[PDB]
Amino acid sequence: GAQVSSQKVGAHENSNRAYGGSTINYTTINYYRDSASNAASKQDFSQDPSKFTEPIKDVLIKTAPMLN
Amino acid sequence: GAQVSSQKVGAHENSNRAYGGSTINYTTINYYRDSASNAASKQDFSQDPSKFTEPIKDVLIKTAPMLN
Amino acid sequence: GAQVSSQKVGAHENSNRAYGGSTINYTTINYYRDSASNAASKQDFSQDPSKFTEPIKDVLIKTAPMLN
Amino acid sequence: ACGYSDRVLQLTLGNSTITTQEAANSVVAYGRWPEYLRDSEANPVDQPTEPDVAACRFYTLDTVSWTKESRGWWWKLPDALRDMGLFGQNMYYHYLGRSGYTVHVQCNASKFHQGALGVFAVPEMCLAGDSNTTTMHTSYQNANPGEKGGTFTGTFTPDNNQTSPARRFCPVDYLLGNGTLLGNAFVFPHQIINLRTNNCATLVLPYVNSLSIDSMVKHNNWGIAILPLAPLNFASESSPEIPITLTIAPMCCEFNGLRNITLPRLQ
Amino acid sequence: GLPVMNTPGSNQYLTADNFQSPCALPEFDVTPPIDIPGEVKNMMELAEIDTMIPFDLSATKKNTMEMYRVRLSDKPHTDDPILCLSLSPASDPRLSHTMLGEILNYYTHWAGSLKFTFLFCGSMMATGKLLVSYAPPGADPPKKRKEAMLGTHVIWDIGLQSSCTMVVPWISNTTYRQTIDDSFTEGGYISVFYQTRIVVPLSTPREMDILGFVSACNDFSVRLLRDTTHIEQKA
Amino acid sequence: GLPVMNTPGSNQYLTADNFQSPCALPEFDVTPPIDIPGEVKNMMELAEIDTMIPFDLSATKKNTMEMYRVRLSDKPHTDDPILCLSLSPASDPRLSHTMLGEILNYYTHWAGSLKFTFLFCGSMMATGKLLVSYAPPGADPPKKRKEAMLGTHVIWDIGLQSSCTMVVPWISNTTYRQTIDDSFTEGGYISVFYQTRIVVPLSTPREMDILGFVSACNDFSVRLLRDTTHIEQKA
Amino acid sequence: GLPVMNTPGSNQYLTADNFQSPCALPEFDVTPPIDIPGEVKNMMELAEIDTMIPFDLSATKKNTMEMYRVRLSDKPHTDDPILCLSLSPASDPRLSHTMLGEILNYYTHWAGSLKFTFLFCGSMMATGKLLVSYAPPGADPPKKRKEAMLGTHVIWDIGLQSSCTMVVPWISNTTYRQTIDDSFTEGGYISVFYQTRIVVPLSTPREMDILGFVSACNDFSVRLLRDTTHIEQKA
Amino acid sequence: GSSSTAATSRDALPNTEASGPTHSKEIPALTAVETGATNPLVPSDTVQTRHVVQHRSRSESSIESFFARGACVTIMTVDNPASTTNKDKLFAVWKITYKDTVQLRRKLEFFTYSRFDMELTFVVTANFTETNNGHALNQVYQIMYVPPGAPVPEKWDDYTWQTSSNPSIFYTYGTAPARISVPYVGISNAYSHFYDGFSKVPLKDQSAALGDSLYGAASLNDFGILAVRVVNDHNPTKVTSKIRVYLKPKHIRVWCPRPPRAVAYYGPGVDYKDGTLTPLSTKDLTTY
Amino acid sequence: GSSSTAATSRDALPNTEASGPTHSKEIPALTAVETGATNPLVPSDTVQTRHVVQHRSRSESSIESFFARGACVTIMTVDNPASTTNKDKLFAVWKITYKDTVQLRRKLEFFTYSRFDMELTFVVTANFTETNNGHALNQVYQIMYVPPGAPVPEKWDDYTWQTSSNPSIFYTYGTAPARISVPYVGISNAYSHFYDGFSKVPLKDQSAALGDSLYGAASLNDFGILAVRVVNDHNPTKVTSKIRVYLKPKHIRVWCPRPPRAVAYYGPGVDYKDGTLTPLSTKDLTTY
Amino acid sequence: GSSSTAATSRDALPNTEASGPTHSKEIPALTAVETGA
Ligand SMILES: CCCCCCCCCCCCCCCC(=O)O
Ligand SMILES: CCCCCCCCCCCCCCCC(=O)O
Ligand SMILES: *C(=O)CCCCCCCCCCCCC
Ligand SMILES: *C(=O)CCCCCCCCCCCCC
Ligand SMILES: *C(=O)CCCCCCCCCCCCC
């Protein structure tokens, strides 16, 4: 029950028949029934900051006057 | 001869391309011939408590008088 | 998610039903999400030395006079 | 076209309406409008009380006065509304309650006045105490002022009476009364009443907590902190004053665990 | 050998672990099960069984059969309580040694609805109405019927159906409560009052007992296994 | 057993590792999440929020509400600066304790564009034009409008839109800068000047404050996690 | 756990190993490469570049610019050598500090063909023919043109093409030679002689220099990485 | 068999687009912070820009990555003395918390609420204390989790160390640091880093003492204790040991951002102490 | 599932082709090095050759293979003394660099620029120093990476060792040498082995002291420090320890080849010292 | 090769259903514990 995922490669070795290029993957297998035992996957999501940067009721159009 | 089963995930990491969401499984392989050597699977069953809570010969209908 | 690659065999054992001959491969599985954690593959490329040995604007034809 | 504008708003809840002609739009905290507790997040199983217009309406608290010496004011919710009509009664008759709010802060002046109030709504606004010999010692009575709220100070003054300690908060203004710098309070939902621009602040607050519902009498979910970011000034007067008025409406309030009424020790 | 690298945790013995280990008696011929009546699959099945509450723990009644008997009489109506108990099922002394309480003392957290059933043990000629009440926490604990009557309650009419059940619905701020006395997760107040009065004809006992029982409902659960303070071994 | 061979790293505890480990509370009944408002997914979301700059850290104004107020007045035009600040967002004392600065002090490297927004807090009757400037490093830091005007700048006209934003575009030799004062990765100079002058009618305050705010743009990032010097525990 | 059995080698640190290891900076945002001119993929590319030979290591010329200049003159024909050098590219003092020699001192073994190119730096009016020779080992090292002429050689005519290359073909008993002075893997003798003589007209310098260069051919390789004796750190 | 793997934390940030001169009624630069919004500008709104293919990402400042480190939250002392000592063998009891140290506490307190699985790692060190030449054999330690309600040990060797139900770790000195994971165990839907309230409502009809409780405290955060002992019997040469506990919050979510702690911590609440309230240093307004 | 594997480093070099006598206007042997080019000859250009199937390869001189070794870059000293000492317990602080030793430095300096992931391996040794018979229990070491800007420890036991965010390795004495990897962490697109410049422009309008900086220095290479301590408390018998740090550059690319260092290194720049400038020995021009 | 996995121990307990006022001959609250149930 292996999970195979890709690595985001930073420094690439001089190689494209083994390392740097042809997508380098890594493998994870969970050994425990409790998910709290799992390592962190770090495959995380981002979001728009608007709930903090623009919490105003009427939409902000930046080219327009904020007050109108 | 691997057994793959699913985990019931409690805290989910911010991830659905690796952790929290797309069912997280775990793997078990038994290494010994004797089943007493096995770990516990914890995949256990529940049952109705009636043999202790309602051991009466004639069925209990709760909206009805118990004595009739 | 195993990578299988071939070895360049130097000394060959007296064997062609197991070692020396029928291409000997080896296996790599990456255990970490960070590619910096990876071993080196050593599957590297060579290049022509010309950018150092012949950095002249007009092509060198060795059978010809260099100055003409 | 018709002349609708950011600056001109009308808010109506229950039998009450607010109008404003110098608004600076309005804020919905964390982008979340108030809501009733969904079945998938529910927890007490008894049928809740939902007072609707009886409690979800604008209540105006006692007005305060802004002067050149004001350091700032604070209130806690639901505490500031504990004695407000049927909201207060439903709160004290039930073990549990949840509520969101529309907070409308009012402060007008003139085109010749200047000054700016930061109006911040803070989830779990824990404030620092007055003691350097005991921590977490502010009493229930001093932590809960009701509608009069409390004030910030520019100076920390430790209580040295160990015989009969005052047990109150000593909230320093530039430390947001809680040990963090006031310049960063803008990561909380807020508006600024800058007198040349606007005369009010409007904050719509969802119920926020680590639980779906909780004890309103034990726990305040939100704090309202109002501090002068730029001091009041006027013409060339040495002692100008202008009033600040708070009007707050509960929204989507629901209650569970009905029994006899809670009669709290408040003094 | 396969290149390996030991991680933290290596060689520790965690008493809650769940690993394989070699068998000291390989190929042992195990005796098969037979179908013994009474198998249990979950401890909460035992918590759903009614067991009797030691309500009266006075200095002379505690640790005797009398602790289970709540005495009533045909005295004139009063609004004063027959009994008062806190909804702290693992730590109030009247509930903590019931089967529900003793299982809850092996766990740190409890949640769900409970139910109290009372059995009238007076004569058939005795009648009466009682009020059984649950007041969720946060107000003055009820000491008069007037206050108890404002919370969750059942008015019990004594008669041929001998017993009456009041359900204590799960009403809580936290998603689980602690199994110790704790204010933040306090559960409230259980009390019983005379609604009218016990009435008997002549030639009839004027005093009699009621017995009370507690059990969990089907929405009840516990978690975070822990040792109990109900047993010890000194030296 | 499977033949194995331990490699270097075996048995170490790297505090940044990411391995599995046995659970001390197996089958625990975890409480589910609810949808709490205000979830954050990345620390840079907080860096994109405007927070107020303590510009005036004079001996008597530092650590008081007055440190946030930049005082202007209707005095005759001058080419001398209202304020001068270095673009060192994690280490200049005016920027390092803003929300952007305090997050940058948990990282070694920063990169991307920033923006400064100023709010005029004088009366509605007050007018004026100011010049806000960013001069990328390598020359004499601007102390006169003549020099500041040659770099990146916005001329702000005070009026009904109360505030004005100058964007500090990412202009850097390195791909990331250090979060400490460092010449090689220095960022340049921020300054504000009077463009015309503040003008007020009679019966109006002749002095007033502006407030400034800083926040990151959507191209801003940080890396190499590190401890901050902004908190300590002595003994 | 999976039954395992540690083999020899367990827990050692071999400095030439090639294993995985945990990252101390997980999810670091790595700066991408740019296309910098001059990338090198193999050390032998550097060995194929001509570098200049310090031929004259006399007590007064060694460690000065004069060590690179081989002086010729228009003297009458002689059969005596202009220079004599051993084909020991990593250990003869004239070759060991050339780029080829300094790379060969990080390896134990070398193999393949080499080439020597000479540049005439006299005036345009100077003429001459020289004989450049390579004598594979095993006989008396050539000290007279008569013997040198019997081995591999190029007769160089000086003229508009300023320079002349002699290839030293790989001629060896072993498949690789040692990078130290060693008789079993000795490489033979390089020498230069006057074939006719340098001739100049009047009003012309009668003495002048030639410069020599060495580089590897495309069939050249090295192996068995080792430390060099060309750098040290005392205490 | 094999599973193989919308804006993610490691995605490249947006490119800069080329933009030229402008003269119009569009006014990105002017704004009004009174509204409570931050002006969403990028450089092409106020200067001319070239095109740039952006490769940087925010991968290391995701919540998970900001917290992906073990931090020391306590040091527990234990010993194993001679049997002839007047002093009792020391076992340690620690009420579990991240508030006894300051670094992890400050990072978590950028937020009001959080949810996470907890990884605990234990580093154990020992030493001799009496200038004696006597020796000791390798020690085994028992780290027992005593959850609220379970009997806390009163002696290093009483019955509670039987641990029939509490989880315990028996750690052997000199081996790899011990490590366990725990699920999100809160009695709420998230851990509360701040609780603006009390655990008791004081009632009018009751004495003030009976209705009193600490401000900001609740069993929201009572997680019980760790009890640690040297299992080996008394030895003639005394050895003292320390157990350092490291906490890493993994699989973490957080809510409601807060200004970070700016003056020194002073107890488990938000209180501050006189003499520590001046975080900012002196700098003149017109000095770079 | 299973992935299975244009001139590569291990390919055989070109064969020698047979070539015979020649008499023509083709002139491979004559050339002109003034052009800056090296004459690309092979033996068949100037002698008669036979055919040879070439099997040798340049596999061991690829950049990766030339550098595929851990090299010692520093030795750090620490100790754990009695508590009665007048002298403070020694913890070590090392500014990370490959320039404190000479062998790896010389190899990297065949190039101007490089990119690589770094593998660090740590060998730890300890010994007694006072001729005493007292003993010590097995030590645990903390190796903390303190990146530029983070608080450097001032005492072996101050708060910085909490490491909530810095990465730390806790190494147990007597176990396999510790090891970690680090990505390419440069603030540039490649590490600069040589920087011909300054970190400050001195301005006319400023004092010379204010505009001064070291030649060839820049934060291009400031990577912070390693701080190392013995975690165990003071022991009555003093033990001293050494941590040897080995660096292997893996996944490496390099650019712009340079002549190698020919006289002894003299500080972190290219400076040289009087008395070390004579690398060549005596040899007569016509002596083999 | 690989095996991949009726009320189980980890199943959610029953939902509470909404219920309103009642006035009838149904008498859930009255019972008789003498029966042993
Ligand atoms: C044998 C080791 C057992 C370890 C037991 C761990 C017990 C639970 C600890 C919960 C840690 C809570 C951290 C957040 C606290 C908060 O709410 O402020
Ligand atoms: C717990 C161990 C952490 C190890 C931290 C490694 C920190 C980065 C070191 C960069 C090494 C740079 C080598 C090339 C230097 C140069 O530019 O000249
Ligand atoms: C998916 O899990 C099936 C593929 C199995 C691959 C080999 C498993 C390696 C050993 C895991 C042992 C079980 C861990 C408790
Ligand atoms: C099912 O068992 C076939 C799949 C095998 C997967 C790899 C097995 C991992 C090693 C188990 C070794 C034998 C244990 C005694
Ligand atoms: C590809 O990875 C699928 C084939 C899996 C083969 C067995 C994997 C052996 C154990 C790897 C464990 C996970 C490492 C973190």
Side-chain angles (χ1 to χ4, degrees), chain C residues 37-50:
Chain C
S37 289
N38 301 343
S41 70
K42 310 294 176 69
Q43 293 166 39
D44 300 312
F45 287 111
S46 294
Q47 71 185 3
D48 167 12
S50 291

PDB file of all heavy atoms in Angstrom, chain C residues 37-50:
ATOM      1  N   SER C  37      18.059  15.040   0.444  1.00  0.00           N
ATOM      2  CA  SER C  37      18.301  13.815   1.169  1.00  0.00           C
ATOM      3  C   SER C  37      18.748  12.653   0.315  1.00  0.00           C
ATOM      4  O   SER C  37      19.266  11.661   0.824  1.00  0.00           O
ATOM      5  CB  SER C  37      17.093  13.309   1.860  1.00  0.00           C
ATOM      6  OG  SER C  37      16.661  14.045   2.981  1.00  0.00           O
ATOM      7  N   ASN C  38      18.506  12.712  -0.987  1.00  0.00           N
ATOM      8  CA  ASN C  38      18.875  11.617  -1.856  1.00  0.00           C
ATOM      9  C   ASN C  38      20.353  11.301  -1.954  1.00  0.00           C
ATOM     10  O   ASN C  38      21.224  12.167  -1.867  1.00  0.00           O
ATOM     11  CB  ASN C  38      18.443  11.846  -3.275  1.00  0.00           C
ATOM     12  CG  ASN C  38      16.947  12.026  -3.445  1.00  0.00           C
ATOM     13  OD1 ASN C  38      16.140  11.705  -2.588  1.00  0.00           O
ATOM     14  ND2 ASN C  38      16.442  12.534  -4.533  1.00  0.00           N
ATOM     15  N   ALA C  39      20.662  10.034  -2.151  1.00  0.00           N
ATOM     16  CA  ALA C  39      22.020   9.675  -2.501  1.00  0.00           C
ATOM     17  C   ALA C  39      22.401  10.244  -3.882  1.00  0.00           C
ATOM     18  O   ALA C  39      21.564  10.835  -4.576  1.00  0.00           O
ATOM     19  CB  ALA C  39      22.164   8.162  -2.545  1.00  0.00           C
ATOM     20  N   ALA C  40      23.647  10.237  -4.300  1.00  0.00           N
ATOM     21  CA  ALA C  40      24.012  10.686  -5.630  1.00  0.00           C
ATOM     22  C   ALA C  40      23.739   9.574  -6.625  1.00  0.00           C
ATOM     23  O   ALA C  40      24.076   8.422  -6.350  1.00  0.00           O
ATOM     24  CB  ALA C  40      25.480  11.009  -5.709  1.00  0.00           C
ATOM     25  N   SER C  41      23.166   9.793  -7.796  1.00  0.00           N
ATOM     26  CA  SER C  41      22.974   8.639  -8.676  1.00  0.00           C
ATOM     27  C   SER C  41      24.219   8.221  -9.435  1.00  0.00           C
ATOM     28  O   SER C  41      24.325   7.104  -9.907  1.00  0.00           O
ATOM     29  CB  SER C  41      21.933   8.869  -9.735  1.00  0.00           C
ATOM     30  OG  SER C  41      22.464   9.806 -10.658  1.00  0.00           O
ATOM     31  N   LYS C  42      25.143   9.158  -9.633  1.00  0.00           N
ATOM     32  CA  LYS C  42      26.372   8.982 -10.414  1.00  0.00           C
ATOM     33  C   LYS C  42      26.138   8.687 -11.900  1.00  0.00           C
ATOM     34  O   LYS C  42      27.077   8.474 -12.673  1.00  0.00           O
ATOM     35  CB  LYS C  42      27.261   7.855  -9.872  1.00  0.00           C
ATOM     36  CG  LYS C  42      27.571   7.857  -8.382  1.00  0.00           C
ATOM     37  CD  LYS C  42      28.417   9.022  -7.957  1.00  0.00           C
ATOM     38  CE  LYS C  42      28.639   9.057  -6.430  1.00  0.00           C
ATOM     39  NZ  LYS C  42      29.491   7.978  -5.966  1.00  0.00           N
ATOM     40  N   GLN C  43      24.889   8.765 -12.371  1.00  0.00           N
ATOM     41  CA  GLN C  43      24.571   8.537 -13.788  1.00  0.00           C
ATOM     42  C   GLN C  43      24.816   9.882 -14.467  1.00  0.00           C
ATOM     43  O   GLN C  43      23.893  10.652 -14.735  1.00  0.00           O
ATOM     44  CB  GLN C  43      23.080   8.094 -13.920  1.00  0.00           C
ATOM     45  CG  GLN C  43      22.827   6.699 -13.281  1.00  0.00           C
ATOM     46  CD  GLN C  43      21.367   6.235 -13.032  1.00  0.00           C
ATOM     47  OE1 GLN C  43      20.421   6.445 -13.808  1.00  0.00           O
ATOM     48  NE2 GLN C  43      21.017   5.555 -11.937  1.00  0.00           N
ATOM     49  N   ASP C  44      26.070  10.239 -14.719  1.00  0.00           N
ATOM     50  CA  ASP C  44      26.340  11.600 -15.156  1.00  0.00           C
ATOM     51  C   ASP C  44      26.704  11.806 -16.604  1.00  0.00           C
ATOM     52  O   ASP C  44      27.107  10.876 -17.295  1.00  0.00           O
ATOM     53  CB  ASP C  44      27.436  12.163 -14.245  1.00  0.00           C
ATOM     54  CG  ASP C  44      26.959  12.151 -12.785  1.00  0.00           C
ATOM     55  OD1 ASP C  44      25.855  12.599 -12.496  1.00  0.00           O
ATOM     56  OD2 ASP C  44      27.633  11.635 -11.904  1.00  0.00           O
ATOM     57  N   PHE C  45      26.556  13.010 -17.114  1.00  0.00           N
ATOM     58  CA  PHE C  45      26.857  13.259 -18.514  1.00  0.00           C
ATOM     59  C   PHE C  45      28.203  13.875 -18.782  1.00  0.00           C
ATOM     60  O   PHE C  45      28.793  14.532 -17.919  1.00  0.00           O
ATOM     61  CB  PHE C  45      25.811  14.176 -19.117  1.00  0.00           C
ATOM     62  CG  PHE C  45      24.569  13.329 -19.253  1.00  0.00           C
ATOM     63  CD1 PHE C  45      23.458  13.586 -18.433  1.00  0.00           C
ATOM     64  CD2 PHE C  45      24.553  12.255 -20.171  1.00  0.00           C
ATOM     65  CE1 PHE C  45      22.330  12.740 -18.525  1.00  0.00           C
ATOM     66  CE2 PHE C  45      23.424  11.414 -20.261  1.00  0.00           C
ATOM     67  CZ  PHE C  45      22.310  11.665 -19.440  1.00  0.00           C
ATOM     68  N   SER C  46      28.697  13.624 -19.971  1.00  0.00           N
ATOM     69  CA  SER C  46      29.924  14.261 -20.404  1.00  0.00           C
ATOM     70  C   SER C  46      29.591  15.319 -21.421  1.00  0.00           C
ATOM     71  O   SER C  46      28.483  15.371 -21.947  1.00  0.00           O
ATOM     72  CB  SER C  46      30.864  13.312 -21.087  1.00  0.00           C
ATOM     73  OG  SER C  46      31.290  12.379 -20.108  1.00  0.00           O
ATOM     74  N   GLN C  47      30.547  16.153 -21.768  1.00  0.00           N
ATOM     75  CA  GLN C  47      30.352  17.128 -22.826  1.00  0.00           C
ATOM     76  C   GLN C  47      31.663  17.324 -23.568  1.00  0.00           C
ATOM     77  O   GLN C  47      32.764  16.979 -23.124  1.00  0.00           O
ATOM     78  CB  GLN C  47      29.918  18.499 -22.276  1.00  0.00           C
ATOM     79  CG  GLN C  47      31.010  19.254 -21.521  1.00  0.00           C
ATOM     80  CD  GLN C  47      30.525  20.551 -20.877  1.00  0.00           C
ATOM     81  OE1 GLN C  47      29.356  20.924 -20.910  1.00  0.00           O
ATOM     82  NE2 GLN C  47      31.344  21.375 -20.259  1.00  0.00           N
ATOM     83  N   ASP C  48      31.531  17.911 -24.735  1.00  0.00           N
ATOM     84  CA  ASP C  48      32.675  18.328 -25.529  1.00  0.00           C
ATOM     85  C   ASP C  48      33.438  19.461 -24.813  1.00  0.00           C
ATOM     86  O   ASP C  48      32.791  20.375 -24.300  1.00  0.00           O
ATOM     87  CB  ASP C  48      32.069  18.754 -26.860  1.00  0.00           C
ATOM     88  CG  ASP C  48      32.916  19.536 -27.854  1.00  0.00           C
ATOM     89  OD1 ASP C  48      34.132  19.656 -27.720  1.00  0.00           O
ATOM     90  OD2 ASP C  48      32.336  20.045 -28.822  1.00  0.00           O
ATOM     91  N   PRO C  49      34.767  19.494 -24.773  1.00  0.00           N
ATOM     92  CA  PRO C  49      35.557  20.468 -24.024  1.00  0.00           C
ATOM     93  C   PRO C  49      35.677  21.792 -24.788  1.00  0.00           C
ATOM     94  O   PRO C  49      36.338  22.729 -24.334  1.00  0.00           O
ATOM     95  CB  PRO C  49      36.940  19.944 -23.895  1.00  0.00           C
ATOM     96  CG  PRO C  49      37.004  18.723 -24.771  1.00  0.00           C
ATOM     97  CD  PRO C  49      35.613  18.440 -25.310  1.00  0.00           C
ATOM     98  N   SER C  50      35.105  21.899 -25.990  1.00  0.00           N
ATOM     99  CA  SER C  50      35.294  23.049 -26.861  1.00  0.00           C
ATOM    100  C   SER C  50      35.118  24.438 -26.353  1.00  0.00           C
ATOM    101  O   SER C  50      35.789  25.362 -26.784  1.00  0.00           O
ATOM    102  CB  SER C  50      34.409  23.042 -28.075  1.00  0.00           C
ATOM    103  OG  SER C  50      34.916  21.971 -28.846  1.00  0.00           O
TER     104      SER C  50
END
